[PDB]
Amino acid sequence: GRKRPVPKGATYGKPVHHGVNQLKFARSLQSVAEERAGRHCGALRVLNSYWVGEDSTYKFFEVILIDPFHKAIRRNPDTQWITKPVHKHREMRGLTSAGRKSRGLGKGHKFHHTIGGSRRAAWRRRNTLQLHRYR
Amino acid sequence: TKGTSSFGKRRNKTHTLCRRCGSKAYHLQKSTCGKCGYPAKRKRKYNWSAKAKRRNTTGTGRMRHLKIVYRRFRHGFREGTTPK
Amino acid sequence: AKIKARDLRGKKKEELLKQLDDLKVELSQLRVAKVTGGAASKLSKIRVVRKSIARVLTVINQTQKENLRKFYKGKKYKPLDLRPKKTRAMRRRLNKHEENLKTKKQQRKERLYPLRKYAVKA
Amino acid sequence: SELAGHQTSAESWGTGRAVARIPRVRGGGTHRSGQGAFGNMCRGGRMFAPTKTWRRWHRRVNTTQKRYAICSALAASALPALVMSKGHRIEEVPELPLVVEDKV
Amino acid sequence: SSHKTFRIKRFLAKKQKQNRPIPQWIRMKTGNKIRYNSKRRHWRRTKLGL
Amino acid sequence: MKFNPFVTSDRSKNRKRHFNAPSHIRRKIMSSPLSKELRQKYNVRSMPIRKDDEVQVVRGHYKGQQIGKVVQVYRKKYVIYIERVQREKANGTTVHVGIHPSKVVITRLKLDKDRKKILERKAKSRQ
Amino acid sequence: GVCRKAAQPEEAGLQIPAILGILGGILALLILILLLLLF
Amino acid sequence: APSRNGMVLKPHFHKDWQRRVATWFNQPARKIRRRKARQAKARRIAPRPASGPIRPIVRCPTVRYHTKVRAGRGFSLEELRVAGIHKKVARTIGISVDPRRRN
Amino acid sequence: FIVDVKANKHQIKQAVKKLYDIDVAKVNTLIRPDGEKKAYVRLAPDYDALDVANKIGI
RNA sequence: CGACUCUUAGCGGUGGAUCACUCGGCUCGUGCGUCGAUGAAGAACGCAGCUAGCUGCGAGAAUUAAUGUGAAUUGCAGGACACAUUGAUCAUCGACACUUCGAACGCACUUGCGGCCCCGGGUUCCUCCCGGGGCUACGCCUGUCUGAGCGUCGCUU
RNA sequence: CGCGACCUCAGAUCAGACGUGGCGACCCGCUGAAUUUAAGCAUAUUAGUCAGCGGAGGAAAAGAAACUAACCAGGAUUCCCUCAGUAACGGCGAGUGAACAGGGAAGAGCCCAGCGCCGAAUCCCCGCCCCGCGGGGCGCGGGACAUGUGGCGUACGGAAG
RNA sequence: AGGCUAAAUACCGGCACGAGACCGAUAGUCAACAAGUACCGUAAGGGAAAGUUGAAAAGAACUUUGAAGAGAGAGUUCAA
RNA sequence: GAGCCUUGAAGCCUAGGGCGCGGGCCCGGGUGGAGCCGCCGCAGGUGCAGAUCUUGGUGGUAGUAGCAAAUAUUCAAACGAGAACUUUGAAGGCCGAAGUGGAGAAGGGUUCCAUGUGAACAGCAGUUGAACAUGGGUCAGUCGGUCCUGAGAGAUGGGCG
Ligand SMILES: O=C(c1ccc(-n2nnc3cccnc32)cc1)N(c1ncccc1Cl)[C@@H]1CCCNC1
Ligand SMILES: [Mg+2]
Ligand SMILES: [Mg+2]
Ligand SMILES: [Mg+2]
Ligand SMILES: [Mg+2]
Ligand SMILES: [Mg+2]
Ligand SMILES: [Mg+2]
Ligand SMILES: [Mg+2]
Ligand SMILES: [Mg+2]
Ligand SMILES: [Mg+2]
Ligand SMILES: [Mg+2]
Ligand SMILES: [Mg+2]
Ligand SMILES: [Mg+2]
Ligand SMILES: [Mg+2]
Ligand SMILES: [Mg+2]
Ligand SMILES: [Mg+2]
Ligand SMILES: [Mg+2]
Ligand SMILES: [Mg+2]
Ligand SMILES: [Mg+2]
Ligand SMILES: [Mg+2]
Ligand SMILES: [Mg+2]
Ligand SMILES: [Mg+2]
Ligand SMILES: [Mg+2]
Ligand SMILES: [Mg+2]
Ligand SMILES: [Mg+2]
Ligand SMILES: [Mg+2]
Ligand SMILES: [Mg+2]
Ligand SMILES: [Mg+2]
Ligand SMILES: [Mg+2]
Ligand SMILES: [Mg+2]
Ligand SMILES: [Mg+2]
Ligand SMILES: [Mg+2]
Ligand SMILES: [Mg+2]
Ligand SMILES: [Mg+2]
Ligand SMILES: [Mg+2]
Ligand SMILES: [Mg+2]
Ligand SMILES: [Mg+2]
Ligand SMILES: [Mg+2]
Ligand SMILES: [Mg+2]
Ligand SMILES: [Mg+2]
Ligand SMILES: [Mg+2]
Ligand SMILES: [Mg+2]
Ligand SMILES: [Mg+2]
Ligand SMILES: [Mg+2]
Ligand SMILES: [Mg+2]
Ligand SMILES: [Mg+2]
Ligand SMILES: [Mg+2]
Ligand SMILES: [Mg+2]
Ligand SMILES: [Mg+2]
Ligand SMILES: [Mg+2]
Ligand SMILES: [Mg+2]
Ligand SMILES: [Mg+2]
Ligand SMILES: [Mg+2]
Ligand SMILES: [Mg+2]
Ligand SMILES: [Mg+2]
Ligand SMILES: [Mg+2]
Ligand SMILES: [Mg+2]
Ligand SMILES: [Mg+2]
Ligand SMILES: [Zn+2]
């Protein structure tokens, strides 16, 4: 888990926030690996990833990348969705398998925290005080 | 000897005209820029100063190609010429 | 005299070159007149001469560009400015043929289950 | 207004620098430097508690009163002494409630 | 500074091009209310600073 | 009453488009009516003006029965200049006087191919 | 010209010494004189 | 801060609400948009009726609402098999198919 | 002569020959402080600067 | 009596309030929803007959071509006034063209120093010679070519 | 020792193609305070917001249940009115704060891995013709991907024979 | 515990566009005008003042004092 | 209101005539040059002495304080409307080689030079100037940058994020 980047343990805040050593950083390490692979090779598109190894400190993932402009993928129209340009850099908008599981979206009573789209969209509709012409 | 006597020892400039935004912030002794951030790739901007955005965003200069981008969008990018 | 582009399009480029040489000679001599004093009347002449210089270079490049197109036409791998410009998103859209290309499963689905016209009142 | 008159940045000077305790713009050379910043009593400040686009403009009336007012207005249009007392010219006009043919 | 790089001379060249007053035939045009160069620069009071 | 949702009743936009319309619209704005005998002969109400007409003034300080020739047209000033209409300065130099072309009656045209075509378009549209 | 030159002061700025001068700055001098005021 | 006999107020305004106010002013414009969308749908289809797919007969699910009856979603493939017609053929005919519904 | 600032001394030395058909002894250049380039061209001892001035017009 | 001072009023000056006007703002809504290695946004420099700004343009520089329009731009000269040639100006703009920096791209930035390939002239040629053109950034994909490995293995000495 | 086959690999100004930078009003992912409130102030609140960073399009995000319910049962997602200032959280203080039922607007469902059946029946690159314009797409021979698994038939509503 | 997808929806940037019980030059955007211009600070950055002749320049020819500014006559127009 | 007005509205002034207890108003007279009001309802950014208020302007103080650090000027002539200052001559002086001299680095950016003007600027004046206007001026194989490394700064490989 990540260490808070303030120097010498100086939060400059209330006693809520003095905890430099213990933060866990919400996103999963699998999505961290997907971010690094994608932004190192930004020309490609990230499909998914999986686990292959761990010993003490290093954790090892393998990431599948789909080429956008090869003709074998620009034909075969089951696959053209990733060539469609709304999927540039899926890993940083969190659309992958680990990305959805980090954003925390499902259905039902265990997911009222994000009612539609994301927690910010839910927060937007819940605290946007709505006013009509007639009240 | 703190004010007007010691102002007279100003002789060495620490800012030269940077080659990207022309706005005199190319700090030689750090070999960087102050305003635009020239040795970095990406252009320096911040949300905490609205007037910097108001001075350096698009629309201020020429938009000397973005004009004809709009003018070609108004018809939809033809490739033929006209009939006589 | 007047140097009309319509007149110039039938010309050969080796004569366009010599005509442009004469026009630049007129340019330089009237610019000497522009520097020296007694040139009350030659200065509208230097304006129409430089605008005549523009027309001939325009005709030359208009000829050379389409003459380049006439032997890269019908070819794969024609150069970059002769490729369609449009804009970057329109270059990087798929294709009309890749757009209309369909899998055999979806084709047989449309063949078995077509969309009908119906109406329901009576 | 919907936008700041707070485009200027400002601070006060304090008990020293005799003049006042209004915020002031900070600068020099340009002769706005040291004028009155945002506030009401200054030049080029925001108006007091400014107009906001969520003012309650529209008002609702009951539908029964909306129909009652139509009935009352049509009933007042029938009497001749009312409509001359508004300002029309019905002095040489036939009947009050005029009713022409459907050929019109 | 009596020896200086080339960008500085291009800058000072454009500033010497700028520093000149209004010709008189512009002052008598139609709909014109320009009377003088407000952007006029004097070398003692204002310094450009490179 | 205005029924298009794409033309302005707005005073500011109308004055702005008026005082900044380019020259090929200023031609249409500087338009004159024809005399009633010529509108009988040609079946057309109004025309744009040019350098070479024969022009009578209907109102102003210089009024009535003075059919002269136009010489210049400042479309920048929305003004034509008429050959008879003069005034001296203090120093005895004559100068033309500004007449807006709404106060102008055309008695003769200059005939030309494009004027024949415009006149035939006017007659064909008035039908 | 003579008329242009005679015109030129009447239009030539008149308010470039209207840099206004009197930002002034800070005091820190009047109170400096340590009178002590009942030490 | 309080006063005489008056009700305890806890309004929810401490959060900076004046930033995020979305206000109904484009409501008549949206009503005209949705009219033009429905008329465009009617002209863009054909003889096919507007609100084209048929909807079932469905009873609400709460000791409160089970007396009533509601236009449901789809026809519960057991019912659509008893009708004697194939699945996607019903979607082409204009018969709503919802496979999750149980009978 | 007044030369655009892109041109160097060898190109000036070629251009003066290829326009005026006279030799070039040597070429000095400077940047005139208005912004252009002022180029002095010394001619060969055979030719005449007065004749060349009369034949270019100045 | 005069001078001074005060108060009124007429006139005059300093001053720029009120009123009247508005090619300007602000708000609301509809329609559209478009940048970039084919070099963007931004910046620098340059350009008119007389030219500093603003504006508009890029060594074709106050616009070129083409289409429509149909006799002007304008402060002053001139210049094409041609129109029974092609036709001024202005708008539209789809064909050309687009200096240097700028993600900037031959390596850095001091306009410095290069390296190949090709073409015109040089000593009619390589050996640190003039002019011109092209190519020479990083990362990554598909394929080609070259070859490293006591990694695995065969056949052989 | 040489040669060949792979497997791991590097190089190239190799042939062709792609990514970077901007604007950021709306959207998406993370990070993230403090003034203030509580008449003091530590949890709380201000808020998972201002600022920061990375991305994206004309919309994005979401999405065809590991659901809601508990009775005569509904049925992907999105948005509005209600639910409701409620159940609930809280030095149970200040304050915070949902959701399913209901009615509307819009209406849309699908594919693959697995499993097995079809003699790799599949795709990419190069070269020649084919054809008609404003401009590029089917077919024929040889170089590759690929058996550590192209394609067809196939999806939990059952499917295949 | 693998994936795709229109609609209804948000939009103070942009592109044009139409309106207003809105302000009327100390107001309204800071910017009705050569405005992010002049200017200040090394820089981050800060940031103005400034609308109005007349219907038409018809802008005072000419005389006459004064070295000129300035003036007295005369003239323009309904008005100097 | 068949409201009012180029036969003169708004605004402004008024030792003019009046009304109301007042808030204020009505008319007369003069300027002024193109819009204005009464009434019934309606809606506001709606009435000033102050806030060491903000912005703009002008007073008293006042033709006053003050134009005093470094010894210093005088005569004649010239050009000129005009001479305590400009220029020439003569005389008397100062700086006195660690200078009030002769040239450069950094900085300044045309101030360099000539001609013309003396309206504003030079804190008196000026025929003068670094003021304004017009027009000129900076030439390098061998002077320096370019090249070298120093104190250091910074990229790929690598690691971290
Ligand atoms: O110059 C001043 C000076 C003197 C008085 C004021 N004051 N006091 N009240 C004032 C109100 C308005 C204006 N000025 C004011 C300001 C400054 N000096 C000084 N002297 C003594 C104490 C402090 C200082 Cl700073 C220097 C110091 C060294 C010797 N030479 C003189
Ligand atoms: Mg998705
Ligand atoms: Mg209420
Ligand atoms: Mg604010
Ligand atoms: Mg603010
Ligand atoms: Mg304001
Ligand atoms: Mg400065
Ligand atoms: Mg308006
Ligand atoms: Mg109380
Ligand atoms: Mg409570
Ligand atoms: Mg608060
Ligand atoms: Mg007075
Ligand atoms: Mg003023
Ligand atoms: Mg042409
Ligand atoms: Mg670089
Ligand atoms: Mg080359
Ligand atoms: Mg308190
Ligand atoms: Mg405290
Ligand atoms: Mg919180
Ligand atoms: Mg932010
Ligand atoms: Mg980006
Ligand atoms: Mg986009
Ligand atoms: Mg399912
Ligand atoms: Mg309730
Ligand atoms: Mg909360
Ligand atoms: Mg799923
Ligand atoms: Mg999924
Ligand atoms: Mg959608
Ligand atoms: Mg005013
Ligand atoms: Mg303002
Ligand atoms: Mg006028
Ligand atoms: Mg009058
Ligand atoms: Mg008027
Ligand atoms: Mg009244
Ligand atoms: Mg009144
Ligand atoms: Mg109001
Ligand atoms: Mg108020
Ligand atoms: Mg007051
Ligand atoms: Mg009071
Ligand atoms: Mg005060
Ligand atoms: Mg004051
Ligand atoms: Mg005073
Ligand atoms: Mg005294
Ligand atoms: Mg004294
Ligand atoms: Mg002294
Ligand atoms: Mg004399
Ligand atoms: Mg004398
Ligand atoms: Mg003296
Ligand atoms: Mg001595
Ligand atoms: Mg010395
Ligand atoms: Mg003086
Ligand atoms: Mg002199
Ligand atoms: Mg000098
Ligand atoms: Mg000067
Ligand atoms: Mg020599
Ligand atoms: Mg040396
Ligand atoms: Mg580093
Ligand atoms: Mg790295
Ligand atoms: Zn910069």
Q: Do B16 and E49 touch (CB under 8 A)?
A: no
H74-92: b or e for each residue (b if 16 or more CB lie within 10 Å)?
A: bbbbeebeeeeeeeeebee
How many whole angstroms separate alpha carbon D4 and alpha carbon D1? 8
- List residues bridging with H33 in a β-sheet: none
Q: Is the CB of F1 under 7 A from strand L?
A: no
Distance (angstroms) between ligand 17 centre and the Cα of H1 equals 13
The contacts of residue I44 (CB under 8 Å, 6+ apart) are: I22, I23, I24, I25
Closest to I24 in 3D by CA, of I1, I58, I55: I1
Numbered residues of chain H with Cβ closer than 8 Å to any chain A Cβ: 15, 17, 20-25, 27
Ligand 1 nearest atom to the CA of residue G32, by list position:
23
The contacts of residue I25 (CB under 8 Å, 6+ apart) are: I42, I43, I44, I45
CB-ligand 1 contact for G31 (6 Å cutoff) = no
Integer CA distances (angstroms), E16 to A74, I30, I33, in order: 59, 17, 9
Task: Confirm if D68 and D76 have CB atoms less than 8 A apart.
Answer: no
Chain I residue with CA closest to C28: the answer is: I56
Residues making up chain F, counted from first to last: 127
Integer CA distances (angstroms), E3 to A115, E6, E8, E9, E10, in order: 70, 10, 10, 10, 14
Stated in angstroms to one decimal place, the resolution of this structure is: 3.4
Give burial (CB, 10 Å; 0-12/13-18/19+) of C96: exposed
Residue B64 CA to chain centroid, in angstroms?
15
What is the DSSP code (8-state) at residue I35?
S
Q: Token digits for C84?
A: 């369609």
- List residues bridging with A49 in a β-sheet: A63
Q: Token digits for I57?
A: 């017009």
- Where on strand K do bases come within 7 A of a protein Cβ? 16-24, 27-35, 42-63, 65-81, 85, 94-112, 123-125, 134-138, 151-154, 157-158
**D14 contact G CB<8A:** no
- Where on strand M do bases come within 7 A of a protein Cβ? 1-2, 45-46, 51-56, 104-111, 116-117, 119-120, 131-134, 137-140, 144, 153-154, 160-161
- List residues bridging with B16 in a β-sheet: B26
In angstroms, the first-to-last Cα distance of chain B is: 83
Integer CA distances (angstroms), F42 to A62, A63, E45, F68, F116, in order: 87, 84, 71, 21, 11
What is the number of other CB atoms lying within 10 angstroms of the CB of residue D22? 16
CB-ligand 1 contact for G36 (6 Å cutoff) = no
In the structure, how many helices (H) and strands (E) does chain C have? Answer: 6, 0
Method of determination? cryo-EM
Q: Which residues of B touch C66 (CB under 8 A)?
A: none
- List residues bridging with F80 in a β-sheet: F73, F99
Q: Do C103 and A77 touch (CB under 8 A)?
A: yes
* Strand (E) or helix (H) holding F31: strand F31-33
CB-ligand 1 contact for G34 (6 Å cutoff) = no
Pairing of strands F79-82, F68-74: antiparallel
Residue of the CA atom closest to atom 17 of ligand 1 = G29
